């Protein structure tokens, strides 16, 4: 019945992705089925010409990066394609082949952009969401893939100059990398990697003291707390920890957040030892 | 392990207003 007619329409939309004359409408309809159709990612991945058609939408926006000329209509169409790629990135049947094809690298030109226009800010936000869905799988394969790319410097620049939503996702991505044992060891491997992160995190604390954000501060504190697990990083944090994290600067913005207050108390306790 | 929001849903919300305020008569 209706379950059948919906599945037949999805197969029709997937085939319509291969034609430029019908791809825009197919992108719109399929992105609506991202949450309700658990088998969507294998159906997209089944023919690689479908994935090539999705990537063609991605590649078509590269000329809009310099100078930043991306419009809201152009950004919305590609974000729909990114939403379908996010489906493939998070499904356990397609996640490994998705990483083996290095598909996330097609999004890195978007993450490298610095334009503060809304079409680019939301393009980075949706692009960060694809990476965010990858680290939510809690797979070792995801962390190893991200460490062989330049995702850390891309996230750090967004964490200091992006919008609040983009800073939150970018900080969450860094948080998930740090929570992995190899990711923490990677950032503490050299002086430059750790100092770059500590400088960015400290700058965000300064920005948060002027414009408070409970959701962003939660992930910043979690990054600091995880860094304190490394002995060399713990000694460095005893000297460079922002005073706003030791004072009652954020007591009002955390008046209802019991989780961040517990992490902040654990962080200062890890540094006193 | 969550952000408190959906980045793609918030993108659709933000770009819907700008798409209507960028087009020409």
Residue numbers in the entry:
A (entry chain A): 13 to 285
B (entry chain B): 814 to 838
Which lines from the publication concern this structure?
We obtained crystals—but only of a heterologous complex consisting of Hs CAF40 and the CBM of Dm NOT4. We obtained two distinct crystal forms, each with two crystallographically independent complexes per asymmetric unit and diffracting X-rays to a maximum resolution of 2.1 Å. CBM binding is highly similar among the four CAF40–CBM complexes, and therefore only one of them (polypeptide chains A and B from space group P212121) is described. Despite its highly negative overall charge (pI = 3.6), the Dm CBM interacts with Hs CAF40 primarily via hydrophobic contacts. It engages the concave surface of Hs CAF40, contacting residues from three parallel α helices (α5, α8, and α11) and burying a surface on Hs CAF40 of 842 Å2. Strikingly, however, whereas the CBMs of Roquin and Bam run in parallel to the α helices α5, α8, and α11, the CBM of NOT4 runs in an antiparallel fashion and hence is structurally and evolutionarily unrelated to the other two CBMs. At the C-terminal end of the CBM, the invariant Dm NOT4 E835 pins down the C-terminal half of the NOT4 α helix, using two hydrogen bonds to coordinate the free main chain nitrogens of Hs CAF40 A84 and H85 at the beginning of α helix α5 and compensating for the positive charge of the helix dipole.
The CCR4–NOT complex plays a central role in the posttranscriptional regulation of gene expression by catalyzing the removal of the mRNA poly(A) tail, thereby repressing translation and promoting mRNA degradation. The CCR4–NOT complex is a multisubunit complex that assembles on the NOT1 scaffold protein, which consists of several α-helical domains that serve to dock the other subunits of the complex. NOT4 is an evolutionarily conserved E3 ubiquitin ligase that contains a RING domain, a linker region with coiled-coil propensity (CC), an RNA recognition motif (RRM) domain, and a C3H1-type zinc finger domain (ZNF). Assisted by alignments of metazoan NOT4 proteins, we uncovered a 23-amino-acid peptide motif in NOT4-C that binds to the CAF40 subunit of the CCR4–NOT complex and hence was termed the NOT4 CAF40-binding motif (CBM).
